[PDB]
Structures are given as C-alpha cells and as structure tokens.
Amino acid sequence: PGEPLLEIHGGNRLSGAVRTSGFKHSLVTTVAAAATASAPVRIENCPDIVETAVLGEIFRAAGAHAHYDGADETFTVDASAWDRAELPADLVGRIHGSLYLLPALVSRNGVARLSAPDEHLLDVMGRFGVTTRLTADGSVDLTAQRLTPCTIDMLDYTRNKALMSGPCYSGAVKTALLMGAVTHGTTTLQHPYLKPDVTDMVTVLRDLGADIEFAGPETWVIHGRGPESLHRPVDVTLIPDLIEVVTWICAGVLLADEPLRITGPGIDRAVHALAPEFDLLDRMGVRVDVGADEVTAHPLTKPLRPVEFTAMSRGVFSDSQPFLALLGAYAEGPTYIREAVWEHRFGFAPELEALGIRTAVDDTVLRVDGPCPPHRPGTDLRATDLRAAAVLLLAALAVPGRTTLRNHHHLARGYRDLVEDLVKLGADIRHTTAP
Amino acid sequence: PGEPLLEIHGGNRLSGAVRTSGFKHSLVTTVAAAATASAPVRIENCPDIVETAVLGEIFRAAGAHAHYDGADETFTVDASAWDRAELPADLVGRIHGSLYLLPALVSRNGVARLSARPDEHLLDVMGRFGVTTRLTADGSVDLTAQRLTPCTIDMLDYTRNKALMSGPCYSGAVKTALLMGAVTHGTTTLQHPYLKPDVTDMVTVLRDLGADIEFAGPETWVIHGRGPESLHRPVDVTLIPDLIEVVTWICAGVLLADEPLRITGPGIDRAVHALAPEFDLLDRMGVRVDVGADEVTAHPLTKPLRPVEFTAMSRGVFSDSQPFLALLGAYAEGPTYIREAVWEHRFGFAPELEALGIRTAVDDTVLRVDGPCPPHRPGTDLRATDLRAAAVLLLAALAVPGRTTLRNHHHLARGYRDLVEDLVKLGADIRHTTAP
Known part of the structure; x- marks a missing residue:
C-alpha cells in the first residue's frame, strides 16, 4: 500500500507464444x-x-x-x-x-x-x-x-x-x-x-x-x-533468463489450454542450467518439450505429484521456489520446500493463503498442502518482493473473479513488462489506482 | 586391546537369497x-x-x-x-x-x-x-x-x-x-x-x-x-518385514551382487510401500528393484547411478536409511546431498567411509557425497559408532578388494539377527578375530 493497483480478472485461458529476455x-x-x-x-x-x-x-x-x-x-x-x-x-x-x-x-x-x-x-x-x-x-x-x-x-x-x-x-x-x-x-x-x-x-x-x-x-x-x-x-x-523461463513454464502449465511455446536464443542452455528445477518438474509430472531455441510447457492433464527439495546455491534457485510452491498447490499431497540461501523468503505465502492456497511456515521450511488451487475471489494482495509479485499475479489469473494486487513495481526489476506479456496471451489485467 | 574384530576380505561377488526378519x-x-x-x-x-x-x-x-x-x-x-x-x-x-x-x-x-536417548x-x-x-x-x-x-x-x-x-x-x-x-x-x-x-x-x-x-x-x-x-x-x-533390513539388502544387492538378489519376507510389499520415500530416491538414482508380494529383487549396477538431494524426516525418508543411501551415492555421478531432520549428529559413519576412499563432507545437519567415489582403499581399521554405521561400513568393506578390519560391530545384534552370517552365506569373506 501502495498507490497504483493491478486489477486482475482471472478465469481466462492463456494462449500464444512468448519470447524471453536475457x-x-x-x-x-x-x-x-x-x-x-x-x-x-x-x-x-x-x-x-x-x-x-x-x-x-x-x-x-x-x-x-x-x-x-x-x-x-x-x-x-x-x-x-x-x-x-x-x-x-x-x-x-x-x-x-x-x-x-x-x-x-x-x-x-x-x-x-x-x-x-x-x-x-x-x-x-x-x-x-x-x-x-x-x-x-x-x-x-x-x-x-x-x-x-x-x-x-x-x-x-x-x-x-x-x-x-x-x-x-x-x-x-x-x-x-x-x-x-x-x-x-x-x-x-x-x-x-x-x-x-x-x-x-x-x-x-x-x-x-x-x-x-x-x-x-x-x-x-x-x-x-x-x-x-x-x-x-x-x-x-x-543466456535466456533462467527465472523467466521458470515463470512461463508455471504459467503455461496452470493458465494455458494449449501447449505454451517459450522461445529464446540458446534456451536449451538455460534449461541445462535449470537442471535442478527440471528434475523437480519431471518428478511432479510436468511435461516440457525442449528444443534448441524454444521450450514448450504443456497444460495440466491430471494432478501433479508432491515433492521434497531444498533451494540451494548448487541446486534449485531461490527465485524458483515460489513458482514451485504454486505448482505444489496442484499436487496431491504435501510439498516440502526448504530455503538454504535466503532464510526468510516466504513472504508470498500469506498472500497465496488469501487466495485459498494452504501453506505452513516454520523458519526455513515451507509446506504446501496440495491439492489447494487458488479459487477465492475479491481479495486484496500485497507483493513483498519481485518473485512474490510474479507468483501472486499468476495465481490470481487462475481465480475466476476479481483480485487486486499492489506493490507490483517490483516486477520491473525482473521482467520487461510481465503484465503486458500476459495480456498478449489473453490475460485480463488492468492498471488502476487505490481510491 | 584384546577386543573382538571383524576381518573383512572384500572383492567377492555375493549371490543367493535372503529372508528378512520382522x-x-x-x-x-x-x-x-x-x-x-x-x-x-x-x-x-x-x-x-x-x-x-x-x-x-x-x-x-x-x-x-x-x-x-x-x-x-x-x-x-x-x-x-x-x-x-x-x-x-x-x-x-x-x-x-x-x-x-x-x-x-x-x-x-x-x-x-x-x-x-x-x-x-x-x-x-x-x-x-x-x-x-x-x-x-x-x-x-x-x-x-x-x-x-x-x-x-x-x-x-x-x-x-x-x-x-x-x-x-x-x-x-x-x-x-x-x-x-x-x-x-x-x-x-x-x-x-x-x-x-x-x-x-x-x-x-x-x-x-x-x-x-x-x-x-x-x-x-x-x-x-x-x-x-x-x-x-x-x-x-x-x-511387517524390517524396513531398514530391506534397505540394507537392496543396498547390498546393487553394489555387491553379480546376479539379481532375491529378498523375501511375508508381506514385504507393505514394507516397500512404507519405504515409498526411499523407493522414490532409488528410482531417481537409477536403482532397479522388482517388487512382488512376499519378495523383492534388487539388481546389481549396470551403469553409474544418478545423484540426489533429500532430507531424512519423520514423514519422509527414515534416518536409518540415510547411511545406505550415502554409500549408493558414492557410485553416483555427481554430488549427493543428505540432510538430517530427525536425529542430529548421526553422520559418524562418514569419517570411516573416508578411510575407504569415499569422499564426504559434513556440516551440522548436512552430509555431502562427492560421487563417483567408490570405496577401494584396503588395509584400514574401521570403527563403528552405531547400529546402521556398522552395517554400512561392512557393506562398503566388502567392495574393497583387500583386507579391512571393523570393530564395535556389537551394535549389529540390536538391528539384525546375524548380519555377518547372512552375508557370509552369500559368499562374503568375513572372519571373527581379536585385536592383538
């Protein structure tokens, strides 16, 4: 709070192609x-x-x-x-x-x-x-x-x-x-x-x-x-932005009807660097087709599988786990997420909780009780950081109703114009003001 | 000091069948x-x-x-x-x-x-x-x-x-x-x-x-x-068949056997299902285990394993299963990260595995294995700190083409009927000696 607002009208299925930035x-x-x-x-x-x-x-x-x-x-x-x-x-x-x-x-x-x-x-x-x-x-x-x-x-x-x-x-x-x-x-x-x-x-x-x-x-x-x-x-x-790729895969799996094509020069090299993340995606049941300059994320066809992992320096990125937490809400069972880089980095959890996602936080450990997809409309969310704003926005798009998101100014430090790119796919996001 | 030892001559391939206890x-x-x-x-x-x-x-x-x-x-x-x-x-x-x-x-x-405790x-x-x-x-x-x-x-x-x-x-x-x-x-x-x-x-x-x-x-x-x-x-x-004994034999069959090791037990399928977190890891490492009703079949290595990172927890992988997964990690191509979230300070087997040639690193609740680093160094004197430590050291010693001594193996009696006898029955060369 947070003067400008994002007025999100979810329920719309995304479709098209996205290009990543460096x-x-x-x-x-x-x-x-x-x-x-x-x-x-x-x-x-x-x-x-x-x-x-x-x-x-x-x-x-x-x-x-x-x-x-x-x-x-x-x-x-x-x-x-x-x-x-x-x-x-x-x-x-x-x-x-x-x-x-x-x-x-x-x-x-x-x-x-x-x-x-x-x-x-x-x-x-x-x-x-x-x-x-x-x-x-x-x-x-x-x-x-x-x-x-x-x-x-x-x-x-x-x-x-x-x-x-x-x-x-x-x-x-x-x-x-x-x-x-x-x-x-x-x-x-x-x-x-x-x-x-x-x-x-x-x-x-x-x-x-x-x-x-x-x-x-x-x-x-x-x-x-x-x-x-x-x-x-x-x-x-x-190299294509590693977290942006993760962001779009999460978006394609949860918000798209048709396989979302994600392009980028030498994105196969970005995927190889995202090997810890892609191991989890495979373990959760997420399907991603990998090419040289494009990857293709497939929409959900059935409940995902719960996973247990630790976000670490020589493993899964700390910027990756919020999106994996959202995916955990579509899995059948508890998903355990331990943070081993930025200890207290689950500020998105209370906001996801307002949407209907059930989480538990103790120190460095986050647990998602799947299945618990976001469904509650008419909420007012506050972003705490960059990746928080991104994951909240994606979650709000899944909710068939109106959601207001503030502190979305963080997005500019991680994406060119994530709002605009989502809108191109059919997302109904509007720029407004609090009063 | 006039104290009972186990004299291990590894390098021999194990074969046969094993029956689990409750x-x-x-x-x-x-x-x-x-x-x-x-x-x-x-x-x-x-x-x-x-x-x-x-x-x-x-x-x-x-x-x-x-x-x-x-x-x-x-x-x-x-x-x-x-x-x-x-x-x-x-x-x-x-x-x-x-x-x-x-x-x-x-x-x-x-x-x-x-x-x-x-x-x-x-x-x-x-x-x-x-x-x-x-x-x-x-x-x-x-x-x-x-x-x-x-x-x-x-x-x-x-x-x-x-x-x-x-x-x-x-x-x-x-x-x-x-x-x-x-x-x-x-x-x-x-x-x-x-x-x-x-x-x-x-x-x-x-x-x-x-x-x-x-x-x-x-x-x-x-x-x-x-x-x-x-x-x-x-x-x-x-x-129900002993959960950790099943893990122990699967670890042994993969690393020490030359033919698929048959492991029997009444209702062992229930034991397997209970070991679901462990089996998810085994599948991720590339370990093949045929699961039946009263028997499971562990297959020896056909190629290097894959590394994994996980946390031993109450509603997940057993704390007693972790040492055997650490040994398997020594045969994987890459770093295996093991986090203990139940019994703090039970990586006492790690410095002993180090003597055999296995590369490990320990910081508080975390153990890391730098695979590939299979045990190979003979002529060492290994000391067991606990039950599962004695078992995993004995298995690793059987892989080493040479002589290895292991003491404080009295811990095994509290977890296994007679692990030495069962192993020897499969072709292992383990002898009961004394320190002097």
Whole structure:
C-alpha cells in the first residue's frame, strides 16, 4: 500500500507464444566485467529492465559509454573513458548490481566509496589488499595502493559448507573473479559458484584478455595481468533468463489450454542450467518439450505429484521456489520446500493463503498442502518482493473473479513488462489506482 | 586391546537369497500394547534380536508370560498375571523399547520407576494424562497416577519443525499418547500423528485387543478409551518385514551382487510401500528393484547411478536409511546431498567411509557425497559408532578388494539377527578375530 493497483480478472485461458529476455544476473556480471576493461562490450539478447537502464546511466555519469538499442535488444558499453571515483548515490542505490562495480572503481582509482549486505564483498576485496574505511553515514571507503593475488576457498562465504550454499556465496565468487582479473599475479579460487551468473562472466573476462584456467572441477586459477590486459573487444549473447523461463513454464502449465511455446536464443542452455528445477518438474509430472531455441510447457492433464527439495546455491534457485510452491498447490499431497540461501523468503505465502492456497511456515521450511488451487475471489494482495509479485499475479489469473494486487513495481526489476506479456496471451489485467 | 574384530576380505561377488526378519520397531510397539492387555498376543515373523530376548525376560520377571519359538520365529506374550514390584533396572536399561512399557506400568500399578536417548518428551505426554513425576539423584524418575484423564493433543508439539512435521521426539510421543489413550477412561484425540508402520501396526494391535481407535480425519485420531479392562481379546499378528533390513539388502544387492538378489519376507510389499520415500530416491538414482508380494529383487549396477538431494524426516525418508543411501551415492555421478531432520549428529559413519576412499563432507545437519567415489582403499581399521554405521561400513568393506578390519560391530545384534552370517552365506569373506 501502495498507490497504483493491478486489477486482475482471472478465469481466462492463456494462449500464444512468448519470447524471453536475457538473464538479468548475467547482464550484471557482464557489465561489471566491462567496467574493469578498456574495450567495448556488445551485449546481445539484453533484457529491457530497470537494471539495464540504471547501469547505462551509471556508465554515462562515470564519463564512460553506454547505449541500449531497444529495437535490437543490444546493450553496448565501454569503460575506456571511465573517470569517476565516486558515483551518484541515488543512482547506485537504485539497483543491487552496482555493488559489483567496486572492483572496477578500486582498480581504476585506488579509492572508492560505497554509498549507503556487503560484508562478504568487502571481505573478499580485503584478501586482495583493499583497506576498509568506515566514516559513519553507513557508507564505506575502499582504499588500495596496490592489489595482490591470493588463494580463496569460496566455502568461507557459505552458510553450510557441506551443502555449499549461502546468501554470500554467489556475490563473493563474482567479486573475487573481478579482483583477480585486475590484479597482477596468480589468484586461485576454490569451490566456486557454478551457475551462468559466474560462468558467463568468465567467458567475457577471457574474451577481454584475462587468462582464467579451470585447473580442476573445484579449482579456478586466474593468471592476472592487471587492467591493461583487458583491452580486447567483446561480442556476447546473454543466456535466456533462467527465472523467466521458470515463470512461463508455471504459467503455461496452470493458465494455458494449449501447449505454451517459450522461445529464446540458446534456451536449451538455460534449461541445462535449470537442471535442478527440471528434475523437480519431471518428478511432479510436468511435461516440457525442449528444443534448441524454444521450450514448450504443456497444460495440466491430471494432478501433479508432491515433492521434497531444498533451494540451494548448487541446486534449485531461490527465485524458483515460489513458482514451485504454486505448482505444489496442484499436487496431491504435501510439498516440502526448504530455503538454504535466503532464510526468510516466504513472504508470498500469506498472500497465496488469501487466495485459498494452504501453506505452513516454520523458519526455513515451507509446506504446501496440495491439492489447494487458488479459487477465492475479491481479495486484496500485497507483493513483498519481485518473485512474490510474479507468483501472486499468476495465481490470481487462475481465480475466476476479481483480485487486486499492489506493490507490483517490483516486477520491473525482473521482467520487461510481465503484465503486458500476459495480456498478449489473453490475460485480463488492468492498471488502476487505490481510491 | 584384546577386543573382538571383524576381518573383512572384500572383492567377492555375493549371490543367493535372503529372508528378512520382522520390524524391530513394530515388535516393540506390539509388545508395548500387549503389556497393557489381559490377553495373549501371538507375534509371528518375530525377529531373533536383543529386543526380543530382553522384552521376554522383562515379562517373565514381572510374573507375566513370554516365550519365543525360534523355530517358527513366533513370540507369544501375555500380561494377564502382570503383578506389581520392582523391575530390574539393569535388565530394563538393556533396551530402548522398555520405555514404552511405562503406560502399562503406570496404568496397572499406579506407579512406575524410570531408571537411568532422551525420554523427557515421554514424560510430558504422560503428564497430560495426569501422571506426576519426581526425580531421583541418579537421574531416575518415579511416575505416579491415581487416575488417568483423557486429553486433546497436537503431536506437532513434539516436533522440531512444525511445517516439516519432523523431530526426534515425534514418533515416541505418538506411541506413548496412543498407549495412554487406550488405558484411560475417556475420549483422547491426537492431531498430526506419526504415520509409519511403527505406529500404524500398534493401532491395529490395540484395535484387535479391544480398543476403539478411530481415524476421524486425515490428521485426526480419536481413541475412545475404556481402560485396560477393555483390552482382553486375544491377538494374532504377523510383523511387517524390517524396513531398514530391506534397505540394507537392496543396498547390498546393487553394489555387491553379480546376479539379481532375491529378498523375501511375508508381506514385504507393505514394507516397500512404507519405504515409498526411499523407493522414490532409488528410482531417481537409477536403482532397479522388482517388487512382488512376499519378495523383492534388487539388481546389481549396470551403469553409474544418478545423484540426489533429500532430507531424512519423520514423514519422509527414515534416518536409518540415510547411511545406505550415502554409500549408493558414492557410485553416483555427481554430488549427493543428505540432510538430517530427525536425529542430529548421526553422520559418524562418514569419517570411516573416508578411510575407504569415499569422499564426504559434513556440516551440522548436512552430509555431502562427492560421487563417483567408490570405496577401494584396503588395509584400514574401521570403527563403528552405531547400529546402521556398522552395517554400512561392512557393506562398503566388502567392495574393497583387500583386507579391512571393523570393530564395535556389537551394535549389529540390536538391528539384525546375524548380519555377518547372512552375508557370509552369500559368499562374503568375513572372519571373527581379536585385536592383538
């Protein structure tokens, strides 16, 4: 609450085709890599979201170059003329991805200020000889006269070392790689994050001119030659958004009458990365046809099967489980969902409960008592986050009646225009105001 | 140190047929229900283990009747002439199953002494029925109850995680509450009960004794208790095959046999259905098991297995099944993630599997196996920490083409009739030696 409102009239069956945009998180890592380099980086299949717009403005405010071609979905950036030690606070604080610009700011200027969770990020850069200086305001100053190589076991940034999972795991790996690339010497990273988040950043860094060796399955060696080695021009096509694919599969299975075709350049590679999710889909009884540039989600033909899983760093995405919870409402029996990344991330549960979905929450565990599909109309829902807004919207579309959803502004940070895309499929969603 | 060892020479392929024994835990609950009654209870397919012997001795020591016929594996008990006196402490403390005799004792004599796994949750359950407790210096507890009163209990009160419905006090609290409900005058209503045959079979026994237990809802059990005087009907019951023994043999057949290992047991299909969470994992790993009525057939490896992540929980995979699934994970291509949500700190088998060559990692409630990493290192000295640890180490040792020693294998007698003898019968080279 939450002034603008989404007026949802569910009960309508969706039909047609959807095209996906690039992975938001790999967009962040690619741009962060480009900020350290002096060469232009052309990013194809770039999503038209908030993250792209802000990063572009940050680059231009830094004296660098950034341009997004909407008709081409191409984002070209160049930090060769980068010339700022401090970026506008309001701009930086608008997105989360600005945090990975710190290795660029530190290596280029020697001094950087972190405008007011990032202890792990500061701890990682601290391994490379970066001094942490806190002068109130909740803001931190980064200082480094010179960068030194190091050997880091990335399990130091996990909550559970056996499970190899944690909220600080992913960010620490991304930062360490960036630091190692702008550092002279051999940096060794052990037990690194494995999703395309980090994988695609490695490819970009290699193309820039960095020497990154996969010495072992759990050992990455960075033969760093400083920022001056990153001078080679790069052309990269982003992997389709992993969570957006999950979102559309959930939409097709529950809201469509005919098989929903979901397209994207090299989406088969996105599916392979979603192997934990797809294992669950197969275990639940969800049918998805997989092609090279398209996947096809089939509507329900019978009750799904309940599953038990844990959302973890080297497994099912934390952003994936809310959609799997909604699918659990159509399964016959209890679906157990444990969160091993962002402990308290079941804020969508009380809102799904208003729609008729029965859930139980104890600490890190969510249980869905299927079957309990959403059916209650005339409710007023409040989104708590990005994926919450998405899953609530899909659930509301299944309810033959009127549902109001607020705080849907979160959607812009994960999707281009999820409302508009659903409307194209036949969804009846209207933009209104509270009074 | 002059202490008995197992001398294992692995590398040999096992073959033949194995017959399972009755469920150890169902035996306890059936006997516990019998202790409250005034009628003879004939228990067929009764396992010849430590529990059977001690429970039999406890009955006779209290003036009651108990006779085990090892020929046809039949345990016949009768608590009709059960009198009131001191129960031999050392005798009672020999087994864990004696804890569930408390409802019978407190209801028959009004008093019961709990001589010194936790039992504090047991006392809380009985406390709701009006049982009073007081402490003895050595940690012993004296139970008193002039009159028992019915109660309405949500069993989630005895779980660590309410949403997951899992905890170390869950199953025991349900067993106690059910027993207390039957020996109490009045209507007792239990909510969200434990669902394994462990409890399920005791319900059937109590019903056959004369109790009126009703499944009002999916999560609602109602016991119209009419006291111990209502439990006077003779009962014939054939135990469900031991659930963990089935798991143990399936694990053995897949990894150690060269031909499909036939595993028999009366009504083993019920055991399989109860092991549905375990079998869902087996199917996901690529393990083939042919399921029949009185037999199951476990097939040896034809190709590497697939890794799985799961959580051992009360309404899911057994905690005792996890060590054998960990060993299977060593033959899978990828990381197997195992989370314990019942009995904290029981990955004591992991450092011993490490010595054989198996790659493991342990952090609190989580165990990870980095497959492929099959056991191969010979010439080690393995120490068992518990029952299932001794079994899984013995199976892993039989895979190693060399000599391996295993001690503290005395734990096996509390879970298996004679696991060593049964394995040797299949072609295993296991010898009984001594430490020096």
